[PDB]
Amino acid sequence: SQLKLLVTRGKEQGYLTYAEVNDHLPEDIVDSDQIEDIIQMINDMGIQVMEEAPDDLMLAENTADEDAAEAAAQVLSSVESEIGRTTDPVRMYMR
């Protein structure tokens, strides 16, 4: 699962860009809301996925650091095993 290595790369970089959080997504996700949910999950355990690469200004060290990390990781590792949006009450009614 390239998602796990994406999380490790984000930890090693101290941050993740939107290009990074796009390249390593599953290639079968079509619904955007699932992408939003997974990026929110990553941000909850860290690291904040800003939209650009940005030296001597200290960033928030490890605010989202907690056991919540590993559990969050598990959630990510479980997102690839299945699929479903379920995040828009309009979409469920339409289906």
């Binding site: 939107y18 290009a19 796009n22 390249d23």
Partner: protein, 50 residues
């Protein structure tokens, strides 16, 4: 700034085949093999850097 896609996808989308893709960017190394001898259209420039 949406997502990566192999840079040849658009080339195909522009109505270019794989042959056309290899033709536009890459040059050619033609072989005039006289059956045997593996006769190659070698040029001294190709040799440089080898």
């Amino acid at each position: 700034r949406r997502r990566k896609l192999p840079a040849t996808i658009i080339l195909r989308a522009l109505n270019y085949t794989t042959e056309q893709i290899l033709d536009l960017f890459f040059e050619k190394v033609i072989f005039e093999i006289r059956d045997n001898k593996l006769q190659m259209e070698l040029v001294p420039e190709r040799l440089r850097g080898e």
